[PDB]
Amino acid sequence: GSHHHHHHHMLDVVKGNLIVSCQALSDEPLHSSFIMGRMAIAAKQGGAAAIRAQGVNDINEIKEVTKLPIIGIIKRNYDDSEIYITPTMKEVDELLKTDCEMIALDATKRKRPNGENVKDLVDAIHAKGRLAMADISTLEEGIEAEKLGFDCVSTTLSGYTPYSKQSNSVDFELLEELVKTVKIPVICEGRINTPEELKKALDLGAYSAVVGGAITRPQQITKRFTDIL
Amino acid sequence: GSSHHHHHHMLDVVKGNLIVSCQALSDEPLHSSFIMGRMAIAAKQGGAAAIRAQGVNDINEIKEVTKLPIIGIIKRNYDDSEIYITPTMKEVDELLKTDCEMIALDATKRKRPNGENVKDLVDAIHAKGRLAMADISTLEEGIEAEKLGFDCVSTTLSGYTPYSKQSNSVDFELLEELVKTVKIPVICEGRINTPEELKKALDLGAYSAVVGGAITRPQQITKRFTDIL
Ligand SMILES: [Cl-]
Ligand SMILES: [Cl-]
Ligand SMILES: [Cl-]
Ligand SMILES: [Cl-]
């Protein structure tokens, strides 16, 4: 196969810049592709280089209304696994029907639904010429993700697996250690609340960083205000 | 002549608590009454005690979906005044057809459209049993606001009139001077970006405070992140 060549490529475009996660799941007040599209326009207008979004409907809306590069995921619970970020080939194939340039998945050590193997997911993503991002929780998971052929790794799941560091703040140590150790881009994602934390993540050698709720979850932002009173 | 009595009253409800301003004008990405309603629900769920909102459509939606106390305004440009926050009786009457418990208006020293005066607006608001908030820019405007019978004063316009302090951060100086001089509630509003600033406003004697864009304008929030890179 062949296709025409683009001047801009996603990893180059996000380097040194901000990615904004625009997510709102069914139990959140902004659950709506319409609203996530508007959040992404806001993000774009505020200088975001790319968007991370969940679900086919939100991804398609955001692409239409912003034309930004997208990291797409589908979050889905399975009865036979603890993994929920793009757990199986079913979600990969659903995502491949969208135009998102990168697909992120859980690349933890954990058993996937139906006994599926994360290498098969990465290979399917690459077979359609897309990029794969490994959402990890530990240093060793990042190492293995590079070995598996992921295009980049993200610290998304640190603090969201039982055996990873439990914290209410950014996991900067995992960031620094991944930067000591893997060659592929390391993206800092998880609990970035302040511009100072963002700048610190980049200063520590994050290739790029993702800010989510601190921009796109007004409930969370509001609670951070009311908590100090 | 009379009405049933309520247990909860707006000034008591906001005392020591957060008020969230949920506004998106026509040139802003979240412009939509539906969206502002969803933002207000998020704010409510994050602990906001009341909402400040703009326009009859957004006020009515927010009221319907949150049942929170509302500070209502209408922003409208007139060719014969610099004032745009609830400038004339026309806007006051439009607002009085909503259920908003408090109406805020520009209470600066500036000339209003059609040569109208602030006192007449306050009196009309009080004649329908509603509360009036004075958005001011200087200590002297706040002192006059109290004299005119406003129920409370807010520092909303400090730095948004040419004769007031020009600043890109909260005007704590004006807050402190007002608290020590006027007896009615003084509300801190304007450029509150961080929980630490909110806490400081209350610690300096603010009766309550209003946070807007730092919760409900994702473009502005995003720009504060990107500005640091
Ligand atoms: Cl995520
Ligand atoms: Cl939210
Ligand atoms: Cl306002
Ligand atoms: Cl915005």
Which structural domains are found in chain B, ordered by start? 1-229 (3.20.20.70)
- Neighboring chain B residues of A199 at a CB cutoff of 8 Å: 228-229
Q: What is the 3-state secondary structure (H, E, C) of chain A?
A: CCCCCCCCCHHHHHCCCEEEECCCCCCCCCCCHHHHHHHHHHHHHCCCCEEEEECHHHHHHHHHHHCCCEEEECECCCCCCCCCECCCHHHHHHHHCCCCCEEEEECCCCCCHHHCCHHHHHHHHHHCCCEEEEECCCHHHHHHHHHCCCCEEECCCCCCCCCCCCCCCCCHHHHHHHHHHCCCCEEEECCCCCHHHHHHHHHCCCCEEEECHHHHCHHHHHHHHHHCC
Q: Which residues of A touch B (CB under 8 A)?
A: 16-18, 20, 28-30, 32, 34-35, 38-39, 41-43, 45-48, 194-196, 198-199, 202, 211, 214-229
Nearest to A219 among B46, B211, B229 (CB): B46
* Structure obtained using: X-ray
Pick B225's closest partner by Cβ from A32, A198, A219: A198
Determine, for residues B38 and A45 on separate chains, whether the beta-carbon distance falls below 8 Å.
Answer: no
Burial A149-163 (b: 16+ CB within 10 A, else e): ebbbbbbbbbbebee
Among all bound ligands, the one having the nearest atom to the CA of A154 is: 1
Give the H/E segment covering residue B189.
Answer: strand B186-189
Contact between B114 and B80 (Cβ < 8 Å)? yes
Termini Cα distance of chain A: 60
Q: How remote is the CA of residue A144 from the centroid of ligand 2, in Å?
A: 34
Interface A-B, measured as beta-carbon pairs within 8 A, has a size of 130
Contact by Cβ (8 Å): A138, A158: yes
Mutant choice from A15, A65, A219 vs B, greatest count of B C-beta within 10 A: A219
DSSP B75: B
Check CB contact under 8 Å for B32 and A17: no
- The shortest CB-CB distance from B222 to any of A47, A220, A224 is to A47
Q: Helix H segments across B21-117? A: 33-45, 56-66, 89-96
Contact B202, B222 (CB under 8 A): no
* Nominal resolution (angstroms): 1.7
| Cβ contact A217–B42 (<8 Å) | yes
| Four-residue CA torsion sign, B10, B11, B15, B20 | positive
Provide the 3-class DSSP secondary structure of residue B196: helix
Minimal CA separation from A17 to chain B, in Å: 7
Using an 8 Å CB-CB cutoff, list chain A residues near B35: 34-35, 38
- The Cα–Cα gap between B210 and B224 comes to 19
Distance (Å, whole) CA B43 – CA A24? 15
